[PDB]
Amino acid sequence: HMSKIYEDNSLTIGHTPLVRLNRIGNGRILAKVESRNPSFSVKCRIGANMIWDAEKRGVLKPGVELVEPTSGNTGIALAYVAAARGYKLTLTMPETMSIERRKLLKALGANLVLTEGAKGMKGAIQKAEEIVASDPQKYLLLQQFSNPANPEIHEKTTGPEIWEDTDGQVDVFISGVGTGGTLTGVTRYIKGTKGKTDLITVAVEPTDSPVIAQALAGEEIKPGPHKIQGIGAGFIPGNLDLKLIDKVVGITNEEAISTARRLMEEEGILAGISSGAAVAAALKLQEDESFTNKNIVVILPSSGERYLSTALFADLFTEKE
Amino acid sequence: HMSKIYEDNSLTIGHTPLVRLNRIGNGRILAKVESRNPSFSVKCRIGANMIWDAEKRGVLKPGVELVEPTSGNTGIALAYVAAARGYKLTLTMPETMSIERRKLLKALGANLVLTEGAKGMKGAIQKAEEIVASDPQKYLLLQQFSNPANPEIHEKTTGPEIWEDTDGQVDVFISGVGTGGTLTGVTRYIKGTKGKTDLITVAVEPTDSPVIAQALAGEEIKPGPHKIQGIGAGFIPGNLDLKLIDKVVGITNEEAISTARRLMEEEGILAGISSGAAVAAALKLQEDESFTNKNIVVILPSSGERYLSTALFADLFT
Ligand SMILES: Cc1ccc(C[C@@]2(C(=O)O)C[C@H]2c2ccccc2)cc1
Ligand SMILES: Cc1ccc(C[C@@]2(C(=O)O)C[C@H]2c2ccccc2)cc1
Ligand SMILES: *Cc1c(COP(=O)(O)O)cnc(C)c1O
Ligand SMILES: *Cc1c(COP(=O)(O)O)cnc(C)c1O
Ligand SMILES: [Co+2]
Numbered sequence: 001h002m003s004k005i006y007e008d009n010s011l012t013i014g015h016t017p018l019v020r021l022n023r024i025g026n027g028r029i030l031a032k033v034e035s036r037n038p039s040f041s042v043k044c045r046i047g048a049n050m051i052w053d054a055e056k057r058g059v060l061k062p063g064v065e066l067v068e069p070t071s072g073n074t075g076i077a078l079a080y081v082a083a084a085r086g087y088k089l090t091l092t093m094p095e096t097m098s099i100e101r102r103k104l105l106k107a108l109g110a111n112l113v114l115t116e117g118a119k120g121m122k123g124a125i126q127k128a129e130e131i132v133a134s135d136p137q138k139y140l141l142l143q144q145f146s147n148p149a150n151p152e153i154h155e156k157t158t159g160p161e162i163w164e165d166t167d168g169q170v171d172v173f174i175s176g177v178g179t180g181g182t183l184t185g186v187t188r189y190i191k192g193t194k195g196k197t198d199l200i201t202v203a204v205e206p207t208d209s210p211v212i213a214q215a216l217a218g219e220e221i222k223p224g225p226h227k228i229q230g231i232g233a234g235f236i237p238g239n240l241d242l243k244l245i246d247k248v249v250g251i252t253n254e255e256a257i258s259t260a261r262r263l264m265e266e267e268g269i270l271a272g273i274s275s276g277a278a279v280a281a282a283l284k285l286q287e288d289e290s291f292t293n294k295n296i297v298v299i300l301p302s303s304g305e306r307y308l309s310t311a312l313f314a315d316l317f318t319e320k321e
Numbered sequence: 322h323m324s325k326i327y328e329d330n331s332l333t334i335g336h337t338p339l340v341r342l343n344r345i346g347n348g349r350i351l352a353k354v355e356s357r358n359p360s361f362s363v364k365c366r367i368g369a370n371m372i373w374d375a376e377k378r379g380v381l382k383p384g385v386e387l388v389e390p391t392s393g394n395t396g397i398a399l400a401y402v403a404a405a406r407g408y409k410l411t412l413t414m415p416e417t418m419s420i421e422r423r424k425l426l427k428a429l430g431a432n433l434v435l436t437e438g439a440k441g442m443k444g445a446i447q448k449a450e451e452i453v454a455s456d457p458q459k460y461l462l463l464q465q466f467s468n469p470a471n472p473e474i475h476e477k478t479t480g481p482e483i484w485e486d487t488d489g490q491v492d493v494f495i496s497g498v499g500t501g502g503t504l505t506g507v508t509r510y511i512k513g514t515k516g517k518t519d520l521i522t523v524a525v526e527p528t529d530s531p532v533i534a535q536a537l538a539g540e541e542i543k544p545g546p547h548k549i550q551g552i553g554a555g556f557i558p559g560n561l562d563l564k565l566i567d568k569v570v571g572i573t574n575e576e577a578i579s580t581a582r583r584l585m586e587e588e589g590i591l592a593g594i595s596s597g598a599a600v601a602a603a604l605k606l607q608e609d610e611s612f613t614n615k616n617i618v619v620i621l622p623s624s625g626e627r628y629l630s631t632a633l634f635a636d637l638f639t
Contacts, residue, residue, distance in 0.1 A: 001322065005351055005484035006340045009589045012354070017333035018326050022406075030326060033333070036357060039591065042627065081587030086343075100629050106637040107625060109586040164324040266429040268330045268404030270360065304428060305361065305626060311423045321427075 008084040009038045010048040014157040018165040018297065021279070023266035024259070027297050028273075029282045030170075031269060032162065035303035039073075041078040042301040043156075046181055047077025049153035050142045051085060060140055065090065067131050067139045069124035071097040072230060073302060074144050074179075080110035090131060090139075092124040098309055144181050146238030154185025155193075162186060162297050163194055170196075171294035174249075174281050176204040176231040176274045177212060180240025182299055187244040200246045200294070204274075204281045206232040207250040209240050215242060227253040227311050230274040230301050249281035253311070256280060260312055264304055272302035329371040329405040330359045334479040339486040339618065342600070344587040345580070350603045350617050351491075353483065354590060356624035360394075360401040360429075363622040366474040367487030367502055368398025371463045372406060374470035380461055386411065387461045390449040392418065392442060393551060394623060395465050395500075400429035408629055411452060413445040419630065436452075463556075467498050475506025476514070483507060483618050491517075492615035495570075495602050497525040497552040497595045498533060501561025503620055508565040509520055521567045521615075525602045527553040528571040536563055548574040548632065551595040551622055570602035577601060578633055585625055593623030 006012050008067045016036040021029040037044035054060035064087075071093035082089035091105060095114040113131070115123040132139040141158055144150055149233055162170055169210050174191065175183040187201045206226035214221055215236050223234025228251065236242065260276025263269045271279075278298045304312060327333045328362035337357040342350040375381040386409040389399055396412045403410035412426060416435040424432055434452065436444040453460040465471055481489055491511065496504040508522045524533045527547035535542050536557050544555025549572065557563065581597025584590045592600075599619045606612040625633055 003482075003488075004339075005486060008343065009338075009340050009354070012338040012340060012357070015336075015575050017330075017359075018334060019330050020328055022329060033330075033359070036333070036359070037359075038338075038354070038357070040356075040361070040624065080589035080591070083586060085589075103629050103634040103637060104591075107582065107585040107634060108589060109420055141420070161324075165326060167324075199497060248541075261428060264428040265404055268359070268401035268406075268429060270401065270429075303361065305425065308421045308424060313421075313428065317424060317427055 010051070010081045010084045012160060013045045013048045016161065018162070019269060021267055024262050024279060025283055025286050026292065028294065029279065029298055030278065031298055031300050033269060033297055034301050035270065039076045040303050040306065041073040041077065041184055042299060043073040043077035045153045046144060046150045046155055047074065047081040050144065050147055050149045051078070051081045051087070053152070054140060054142065054148035059110055060278060061089070063138070064140050065138055066142060066179065067092070067128050068142050068144065069093065069121065069128040070144065071101070071124065075101070075105055075110065076108070076285065078142070079105050079110040083109045084096060089135060092127040092131070094120055094124055100309060145233070148239070150179055150181035150239045151185035151188065154182050155189045158182060159186040159189025163190060166295060166297065168194070169295050170199065170297045172200045172285065172291065172296040174202040174204060174278050174298040176299065177240055178227070178231050178233060180237045184239055184241045184244060186191055191244065201244055202247045202249055202281060202285065204231065204249050204251055204278050205247045207252045209234050210250045211235060212240070212245065213248045213250065216245065216248060228256045228273050228277045229258045229310065230272065231277065249284055251277040251280050259283070260304060261316065263300070269300065270303040270305055271300055272307050273298035273310065275302060276277045331372070331402045331405045333359050333629050334366045334369045335482060337482065339483070342588055346601060346604055347607050347613065349534050349615060350600065350619055352590060352600065352619050352621050355620055356591065360397045361618060361624050361627065362394040362398065363503060364394035364398035365401070366478055367465060367471045368395065368402040370464065370474035371468055371470045372399070372402045372408065374473070375461060375463070376474060381408065381485065384459065385461050386459055387463060388449050388452050389463045389465065390414070390442065390445040390452050391465065392445065396426055396431065397429065399463065400426050400431040404430045413448045413452070415441055415445055421630070436448060451498060466554070469560070471500055471502035471560045472506035472509065473496050475503050476510045480507040480510025484511060487616060487618065489515065489517070490616050491520065491618045493521045493523060493606065493612065493617040495523040495525060495599050495617060495619040497549070497599045497620070497622065498561055499551050499554060501558045505560055505562045505565060512565065522565055523553065523568045523570055523602060523606065524566045525572060525599050528557050528573050531571045532556060533561070533566065534569040534571060536571060543618065549577045551593065552598060570605055572598040572601045578606050580604070581633055584621070590621065591624040591626055593619055593625055593628055594631070596621035596623060
């Protein structure tokens with residue numbers, strides 16, 4: 001894309017590189033590095049577009065302050081966009097969110113409201129609702145799991161970049177599902193706008209919280225705890241369009257961690273746990289002869305630098321090592 | 322640039338965004354965000370090009386391994402490129418190096434050799450030389466402070482990006498100097514290749530180690546300790562072409578840290594200490610009427626996320 005001066009850092013989102021994996025898999029895995037973003041994750045796109053959309057809809061205007069419950073990369077994305085565009089932001093999250101993330105969020109100007117650790121994200125969602133209810137004219141909740149501006153940005157940026165960078169040669173699209181925006185939006189551009197209805201869209205989820213598989217089977221939703229940060233919220237988000245999914249691959253915590261470590265050591269791509277999960281799903285599909293000659297695009301949501309205090313960098317090296 | 326599939330992560334360097342600063346300075350500071358790079362710093366460009374250059378020179382034949390003494394972003398850059406392109410890499414550094422940083426380099430496949438803490442960077446340089454001397458056919462030292470492939474990549478990528486993104490309108494170019502490659506290579510492109518000899522090139526350094534100022538004034542070189550990671554090595558590097566510098570601005574530790582905090586809180590640009598230093602220098606220039614109407618391009622070398630254990634994030638809470 002074209003040379004310019006960006007008017008603020010929110011406008012720099014996307015155009016992330018698509019990199020061939022040469023040592024992991026058969027040479028047809030193409031990794032889309034979504035840590036090449038202004039706050040270093042796929043969420044940069046949705047922090048930008050949910051705020052731009054709120055501006056366009058007339059609900060974010062001078063005097064209105066943003067609120068969102070998030071203990072993750074969405075909080076970081078909303079923080080840098082609010083700072084870049086001159087909005088006040090309040091984030092709610094359980095008091096168990098890491099010091100690294102609190103430091104980042106405060107440095108970017110966010111106002112943090114810490115909720116009881118025992119109540120997890122449910123307690124943070126309740127606190128965000130309470131804050132907005134205290135002054136609904138003042139506060140705007142963005143609602144990342146249902147706000148259509150989330151999948152919209154992937155329809156307008158992420159998907160077009162995959163189509164253009166592969167010159168239409170993509171055959172398989174793999175996305176670990178958190179909010180579902182990435183899966184939904186990219187698939188709507190490729191299957192819908194470009195008419196490629198035989199794209200294979202693969203949802204990735206934790207083996208220990210396989211709610212997408214349960215929903216497609218018409219079974220009871222029964223989530224569980226797991227370590228693949230950023231995916232597997234334990235329900236079907238509003239922003240996940242189940243009708244667009246062709247296959248669901250469940251990944252273990254250990255598979256996700258080990259494959260993220262391989263991205264770093266074998267490909268030089270700093271990668272988070274969910275990036276390992278998505279590439280591990282590509283490797284499982286390449287066990288099946290139907291996939292042997294397909295070009296597989298995989299989203300890598302985050303950089304392993306954000307994971308130094310997590311399982312990803314634990315049980316890896318001995319004191320002596 | 323042209324839509325494509327990159328054949329490895331080293332080929333994804335550059336095309337970093339130039340962002341107008343709206344609250345910091347007069348609206349004419351244009352910040353080039355060099356953390357938008359495959360290992361998140363300006364050094365990703367030189368990790369790639371020093372290795373590409375070694376390949377082109379025929380000195381990276383099968384069995385040859387890389388060695389470099391580095392405590393910083395160059396070690397992370399060389400590690401991701403060596404992992405991407407299938408080389409073995411040894412980095413030397415003092416044992417002071419944090420366990421978390423050893424884990425990150427380790428995860429990228431680097432072999433670490435930890436040297437005696439009291440001997441600092443000098444001890445790490447000594448150990449790298451000793452490793453190469455133990456088997457010179459096997460080991461290749463990249464020598465980031467003198468290897469011309471460092472400023473070359475900035476002449477071939479960073480410089481052109483600044484020229485294109487500003488439509489040639491860049492009046493002032495500000496770089497905090499570590500190796501000098503950024504300053505040297507960008508200035509060679511803009512003053513030389515593009516012929517814009519009216520460009521004002523500004524070197525930034527710590528007030529507590531003002532060796533560039535000393536060199537340009539013809540004063541004795543007298544370095545000192547400071548906090549501005551990535552700049553101010555306390556000598557004039559081979560890759561710093563002093564002839565290209567118009568002005569040197571010295572920045573305090575506190576000015577660097579406070580201005581980096583403003584980049585984060587006021588602009589939403591995650592920024593390291595040296596990014597704060599370089600922008601602090603732009604602010605000083607904008608106090609001088611001669612600079613008021615000028616477009617000022619400033620390099621932001623790194624992201625504040627790499628500084629979470631440092632004073633950059635101190636006193637954010639009670
Ligand atoms: C540590 C961490 C990282 C990323 C996330 C992603 C999400 C966010 O708010 O940033 C979207 C939400 C999420 C929460 C739980 C499971 C999956 C996604 C959450 C927590
Ligand atoms: C902590 C840290 C960060 C960046 C650097 C930059 C350099 C590196 O090897 O990565 C170039 C070298 C350097 C060393 C001392 C002063 C300035 C630059 C060094 C140390
Ligand atoms: C958000 C996120 C995902 C999932 O992306 P969605 O578009 O929300 O499905 C995966 N990994 C990480 C690290 C994320 O932050
Ligand atoms: C390398 C580096 C610089 C200085 O860039 P040079 O091109 O080496 O002069 C500044 N800040 C940081 C953090 C760096 O890593
Ligand atoms: Co481009």
